[PDB]
Amino acid sequence: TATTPQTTDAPAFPSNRSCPYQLPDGYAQLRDTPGPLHRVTLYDGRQAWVVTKHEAARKLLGDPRLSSNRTDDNFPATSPAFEAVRESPQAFIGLDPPEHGTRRRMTISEFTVKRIKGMRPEVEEVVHGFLDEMLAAGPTADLVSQFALPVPSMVICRLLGVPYADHEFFQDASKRLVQSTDAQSALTARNDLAGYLDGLITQFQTEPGAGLVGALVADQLANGEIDREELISTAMLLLIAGHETTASMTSLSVITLLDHPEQYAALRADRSLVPGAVEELLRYLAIADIAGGRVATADIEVEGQLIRAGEGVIVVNSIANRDGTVYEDPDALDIHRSARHHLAFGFGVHQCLGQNLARLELEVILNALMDRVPTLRLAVPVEQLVLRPGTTIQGVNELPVTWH
Ligand code: HEM
Ligand SMILES: C=C1/C(=C\C=C2/CCC[C@]3(C)[C@@H]([C@H](C)CCCC(C)(C)O)CC[C@@H]23)C[C@@H](O)C[C@@H]1O
C-alpha cells in the first residue's frame, strides 16, 4: 500500500459542492492559485488543464485552436456517462466552425430579442398557473417537481413544438440523461428520447406543425440541409438545456436568496433590481460550471504555460466568475453589484443560445414568487438538502418548501 505523502499537483476534478452557492474547497484552491491554468486529473486517470481566471477564460473560449469536438479521443470527458455524447451525431454544441454556424443559425430565430420579448405574456401565464396549482395543493411542497421543472419544460416545449401531453416521459428521460452515472444508463435515456423525437419528425412530415421542430422538418430537412439524426440531436439539446438549466437556477436561487434575507427584502421592495439580481445569481451560482470542455488542435501558449496539441482543457466558469480582479469580494452575493461580463453562459461562438430566454424566465419567476408567496421558506434546514455532484448540472433534485 501507499506508505508516502499523498499531496498531488494534479487534483481530482471535478469536485462536489457542499454549499449550493459556494465553490467546492478544491475549486477555491484553484481560484487562489496564481496563473490562468492548472493541472487536474480526470475520472479516468488522464490529465487535463482547467482555466481558473476570468480574462484567460474569455481568451481561450475565443481561441479557434480549442475545439469543441466531443468525438475526439482527447476530449476531456468528466464522467463515464459523458461517453453517450460521442455515440450519436453531434448537435452544434459539439461542432466547430464552419459546421457549427450553419446548424446554430437554423435555430437562432426562436431566441431573438424580439421573440423573447413576445414570449413574456406566455411565460407569465405558465409561471402563475403552476404557482397557484402548487399553492392550492397546500404547504410542504417540493418546489422542484411542482414549479421549478414544469415551468421551463412547458415553455421550451411550446418553442420546439413538442407536445406537453408527453411531459412525464421526456422529463424523466431528460433527468436520466443529464444525471446518469454510467454510460449504459445515459445511452438508454438518449435512445428513449431519440425514438420519441424521431416519431414526432415523421408526424410533422405528414402534418406540418408549429414550433422549431415543425419548421426544421418542413424546411431544412426537406432540403436535405440537415440530417434526420442531426435534427434529433439538435431538438434533444434544446429540450434538455431548456428544461434543466432554468429549473436548477430557480431552485438554487430560492435557497441562496433565503440565506441572504436582507438582499431578498431589498429585492421585494424595488423590482427594478430584479434583472440585475438575476445576473448576479447567474454569476454566483454558475450552474453549468464545467460546460467549457475543449481539445487543443495546436500548441497554445498562455502566460508562460504551454497547452500542447491533443491536450484537454476545461474552462471552469464558476471559478472564473469568482475572480476577485473582476468582481470585488467575489464570494459575496451582492444583487446591487455589476455582474456584467460573467461567464455563466460562456463566451464566443458557443455562448449560450438560450441566455435571454433564461433571463426572462428567472425575472418572471422571482417577481411571481415575491408577489404570490412572500412567506416562502425552506421546510428543512439547508444542511438536510442533497446537492447534485460536480459531474452534472448543479442543483437539487428535491426542495421541500412551505409557507403561511
Ligand atoms: C438557465 C441558465 C443557463 C446557463 C447557466 C447556461 C449555460 C450555458 C453555457 C456555459 C454554455 C456554453 C457551453 C460551451 O461553451 O461548450 C451554453 C450553451 C448553450 N445553451 Fe445555455 N445555459 C442556460 C440556459 C439555457 C436555456 C434555457 C437554453 C434553451 C434552449 C439553453 C441552450 C443552450 C444551447 C443550445 C447551447 C449551445 C450553444 C452553441 O454551442 O452554439 N441554455 N449554456
Ligand atoms: C443532450 C444531448 C445528448 C447527450 C447529453 C448527455 C449525455 C451524457 C451526459 C451529459 C453530457 C450531461 C453532463 C454530464 C452534464 C455536465 C456538463 C458537461 C460535462 C457537458 O460540460 C448533460 C447532458 C448529458 C445526446 C446528443 O446526441 C445530443 C445532445 O448533445
UniProtKB/Swiss-Prot annotation:
User: Does the keyword field hold Membrane?
Assistant: no
Reactions catalysed, semicolon-separated, are: calciol + 2 reduced [2Fe-2S]-[ferredoxin] + O2 + 2 H(+) = calcidiol + 2 oxidized [2Fe-2S]-[ferredoxin] + H2O; calcidiol + 2 reduced [2Fe-2S]-[ferredoxin] + O2 + 2 H(+) = calcitriol + 2 oxidized [2Fe-2S]-[ferredoxin] + H2O
Provide the residue positions that the database annotates as binding calciol: 78, 190, 233, 290
Q: Where in the cell is it found?
A: Cytoplasm
Going by the UniProt record, its keywords in alphabetical order are: Cytoplasm, Heme, Iron, Metal-binding, Monooxygenase, Oxidoreductase
**Predominant location:** cytoplasm
One Pfam match, given by its short name, reads p450
CDD domains referenced in this protein's UniProt entry, alphabetically:
CYP105-like
Q: Which GO terms describe its cellular component?
A: cytoplasm
Q: Where is this region: Disordered?
A: 1-21
Q: Where does heme bind?
A: 100, 104, 294, 350, 352
Cofactors needed by this protein, per the record, are:
heme
Q: Which GO terms describe its biological process?
A: vitamin D3 metabolic process
Q: Which top EC class is given?
A: oxidoreductase
Its EC number(s)? 1.14.15.22
Give me the stretches of Low complexity compositional bias: 1-12
Q: What induces it?
A: By herbicides.
Asked if the keyword Transmembrane belongs to this entry, the reply reads no
Q: Which GO terms describe its molecular function?
A: heme binding; iron ion binding; oxidoreductase activity, acting on paired donors, with incorporation or reduction of molecular oxygen, NAD(P)H as one donor, and incorporation of one atom of oxygen
Instruction: Reproduce the miscellaneous comment text.
Output: Two metabolic pathways exist. One is a conversion of VD3 to 25-hydroxyvitamin D3 and then to 1-alpha,25-dihydroxyvitamin D3 (25-pathway), while the other one is a pathway via 1-alpha-hydroxyvitamin D3 as an intermediate (1-alpha-pathway). Analysis show that the amount of 25-hydroxyvitamin D3 is predominant as the product of this reaction, while very small amounts of 1-alpha-hydroxyvitamin D3 and 1-alpha,25-dihydroxyvitamin D3 are obtained, suggesting that the major pathway is the 25-pathway.
Task: Tell me the protein family, please.
Answer: Belongs to the cytochrome P450 family.
Role played: Involved in the metabolism of vitamin D3 (calciol) and of a number of sulfonylurea herbicides. Catalyzes the two-step hydroxylation (25- and 1-alpha-hydroxylation) of vitamin D3 (VD3) to yield its active form 1-alpha,25-dihydroxyvitamin D3 (calcitriol). The second reaction is the hydroxylation of the C1-alpha-position of calcidiol to produce calcitriol. It can also hydroxylate vitamin D2.
Q: What is this protein called?
A: Vitamin D3 dihydroxylase
Q: What is the lineage of its organism?
A: Bacteria, Bacillati, Actinomycetota, Actinomycetes, Kitasatosporales
